[PDB]
Amino acid sequence: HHDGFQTVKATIDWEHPMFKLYEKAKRNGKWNPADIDFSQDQKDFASLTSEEKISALPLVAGFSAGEEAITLDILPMAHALARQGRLEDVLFLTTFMHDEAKHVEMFSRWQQAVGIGQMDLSVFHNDHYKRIFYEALPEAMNRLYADDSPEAVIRAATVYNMIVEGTLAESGYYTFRQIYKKAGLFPGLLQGIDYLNMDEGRHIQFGIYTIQRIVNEDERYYELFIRYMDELWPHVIGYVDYLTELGKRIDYDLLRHYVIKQFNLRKKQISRT
Amino acid sequence: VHHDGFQTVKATIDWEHPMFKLYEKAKRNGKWNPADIDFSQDQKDFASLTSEEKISALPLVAGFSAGEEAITLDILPMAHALARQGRLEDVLFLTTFMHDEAKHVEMFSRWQQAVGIGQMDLSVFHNDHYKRIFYEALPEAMNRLYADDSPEAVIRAATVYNMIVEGTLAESGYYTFRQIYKKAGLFPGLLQGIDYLNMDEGRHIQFGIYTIQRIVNEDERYYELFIRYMDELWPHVIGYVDYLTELGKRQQQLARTYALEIDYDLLRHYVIKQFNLRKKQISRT
Numbered sequence: 001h002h003d004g005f006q007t008v009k010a011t012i013d014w015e016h017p018m019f020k021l022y023e024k025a026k027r028n029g030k031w032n033p034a035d036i037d038f039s040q041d042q043k044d045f046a047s048l049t050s051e052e053k054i055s056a057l058p059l060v061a062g063f064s065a066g067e068e069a070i071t072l073d074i075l076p077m078a079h080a081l082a083r084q085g086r087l088e089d090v091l092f093l094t095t096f097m098h099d100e101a102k103h104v105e106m107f108s109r110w111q112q113a114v115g116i117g118q119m120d121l122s123v124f125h126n127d128h129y130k131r132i133f134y135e136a137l138p139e140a141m142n143r144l145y146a147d148d149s150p151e152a153v154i155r156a157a158t159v160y161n162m163i164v165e166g167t168l169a170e171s172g173y174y175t176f177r178q179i180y181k182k183a184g185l186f187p188g189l190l191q192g193i194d195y196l197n198m199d200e201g202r203h204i205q206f207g208i209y210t211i212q213r214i215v216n217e218d219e220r221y222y223e224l225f226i227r228y229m230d231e232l233w234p235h236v237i238g239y240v241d242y243l244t245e246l247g248k249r250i251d252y253d254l255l256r257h258y259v260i261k262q263f264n265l266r267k268k269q270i271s272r273t
Numbered sequence: 274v275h276h277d278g279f280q281t282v283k284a285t286i287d288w289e290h291p292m293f294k295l296y297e298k299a300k301r302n303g304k305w306n307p308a309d310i311d312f313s314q315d316q317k318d319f320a321s322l323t324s325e326e327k328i329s330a331l332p333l334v335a336g337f338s339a340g341e342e343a344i345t346l347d348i349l350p351m352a353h354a355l356a357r358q359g360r361l362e363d364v365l366f367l368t369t370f371m372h373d374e375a376k377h378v379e380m381f382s383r384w385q386q387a388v389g390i391g392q393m394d395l396s397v398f399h400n401d402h403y404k405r406i407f408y409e410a411l412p413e414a415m416n417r418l419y420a421d422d423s424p425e426a427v428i429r430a431a432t433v434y435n436m437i438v439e440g441t442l443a444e445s446g447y448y449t450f451r452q453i454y455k456k457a458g459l460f461p462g463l464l465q466g467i468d469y470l471n472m473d474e475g476r477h478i479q480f481g482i483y484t485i486q487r488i489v490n491e492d493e494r495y496y497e498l499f500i501r502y503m504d505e506l507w508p509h510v511i512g513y514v515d516y517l518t519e520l521g522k523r524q525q526q527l528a529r530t531y532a533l534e535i536d537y538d539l540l541r542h543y544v545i546k547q548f549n550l551r552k553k554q555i556s557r558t
């Protein structure tokens with residue numbers, strides 16, 4: 001039951017950081033994936049050699065699955081914060097969710113346009129990928145229906161924001177750029193990736209805000225945060241090694257260092273105080 | 274529980290799904306930002322009213338602010354349930370639904386802030402009937418879906434929120450606010466807000482009808498449930514309406530300072546009109 005309503009008893013906290021992030025999201029979040037011209041992307045893909053055609057697909061499969069996952073899986077988080085009365089958080093998360101829907105849509109549209117929509121790209125998810133996306137992610141998010149303790153929220157934000165978006169996805173945008181914009185290939189996908197990377201700058205900020213406000217109440221949670229990151233590293237780098245083994249069949253030595261860099265950078269964005 | 278796989282890895286989005294088409298319309302037609310509305314004439318208009326004129330609109334604003342905030346919290350279980358059923362295109366659409374409702378909450382709260390009543394607690398205009406729908410039945414029917422996503426649970430949730438709250442009360446609210454404050458040349462920024470809001474809600478009702486009718490096509494037993502759930506809520510619908518009516522009648526200072534004939538019997542029949550129209554948008558097959 002609702003006890004009352006903040007915009008009836010009072011107003012929105014206009015000075016809340018997440019309400020300000022909400023405002024930014026409405027201003028900077030107007031792109032529509034339906035407007036992306038994929039026609040050159042189709043030609044590029046067709047002109048590729050089958051050996052080149054596959055080289056693209058592992059990454060797209062990682063992302064298509066990853067965006068769809070978070071679209072389905074943020075909803076428990078939004079619900080738990082709604083139940084705690086954090087209205088400005090909820091306002092922000094509606095932009096988060098619609099961003100992610102556009103992300104799902106964009107990769108799906110590219111798949112469709114280059115002609116691989118009928119292809120099942122699950123074959124490029126290895127065990128380590130499945131551990132993160134098929135298992136740990138939904139596990140940590142769905143927990144929050146029955147357990148919204150600080151430890152549960154921090155574990156979900158760490159998994160979704162610091163590992164999935166902040167290590168794997170950040171590293172993936174960089175990989176796409178380091179490979180295809182140099183080549184002059186796939187300009188519509190790279191356009192989408194650029195819009196998406198803008199969106200994701202906001203998403204990481206909600207995650208930092210969330211993890212940090214909890215850490216602030218008890219620095220015991222800081223060590224929780226680090227432990228959770230390290231728990232998932234073996235699957236992060238297991239996936240990366242799987243993908244680097246594939247491409248060698250571009251210095252994957254560099255992209256495997258960018259992943260390592262991102263992971264440590266994300267750890268540093270949270271302070272013990 | 275874990276994901277089996279992902280539709281946009283095995284396949285693609287179902288581009289011909291009607292909820293995808295509705296998602297596409299939502300993106301194209303849902304660009305308005307309440308932060309852009311000019312409330313300066315509203316703040317002056319509100320200040321130009323007496324204490325007694327000043328309140329005639331607040332009961333409506335309190336019903337609206339509470340209603341928009343409730344659904345912002347209470348749609349989330351519905352989106353989760355459909356996500357669990359693999360209804361990806363529904364979920365995509367629902368991201369626009371939820372973001373719309375966020376803007377609706379924001380708009381009324383901006384208006385309250387700008388006209389100067391942010392500090393005033395407007396809960397006093399929620400009578401027991403209002404509470405039974407918005408403080409109780411709405412969240413009960415939605416939160417159910419976390420543990421019971423059966424067709425009958427989904428019908429009930431869509432009926433409460435989409436057919437009653439949006440399609441009866443909110444549709445009547447927009448009419449009332451037009452029949453009164455557009456005729457009074459009052460609160461232009463609020464009515465611009467309400468215009469945009471009402472456009473949003475045309476899509477929301479289409480999702481609710483799609484959802485209810487989808488379930489009724491599986492089995493007609495469910496048509497009767499829809500009618501019964503509509504009927505179980507009518508008394509609170511009309512209980513709130515009578516209450517809002519008796520308020521307006523005894524604070525009639527704004528009606529005659531602005532030479533308006535506010536017909537609280539016409540407004541009452543429009544509510545009844547919306548209720549039955551909503552029944553007619555669901556067919557037994």
Ligand SMILES: CCCCCCCCCCCCCCCC(=O)O
Binds near residue numbers: 256
């Ligand atoms: C060979 C170098 C490795 C490059 C790393 C690529 C990893 C693929 C990206 C998958 C994660 C995408 C998750 C979406 C996050 C979000 O939607 O916020």
Ligand SMILES: CCCCCCCCCCCCCCCC(=O)O
Binds near residue numbers: 333336377438445477
């Ligand atoms: C005297 C005339 C009575 C008219 C009825 C007025 C009722 C106020 C409506 C408040 C509910 C608003 C819910 C909005 C639903 C949505 O945002 O989708």
Ligand SMILES: [Fe+2]
Binds near residue numbers: 070100165200203
């Ligand atoms: Fe994201």
Ligand SMILES: [Fe+2]
Binds near residue numbers: 128238
């Ligand atoms: Fe391994």
Ligand SMILES: [Fe+2]
Binds near residue numbers: 344374439474477
């Ligand atoms: Fe709505």
Ligand SMILES: [Fe+2]
Binds near residue numbers: 402512
């Ligand atoms: Fe009563």
Ligand SMILES: [Mn+2]
Binds near residue numbers: 067099100103196200
């Ligand atoms: Mn994303």
Ligand SMILES: [Mn+2]
Binds near residue numbers: 341470
């Ligand atoms: Mn609304």
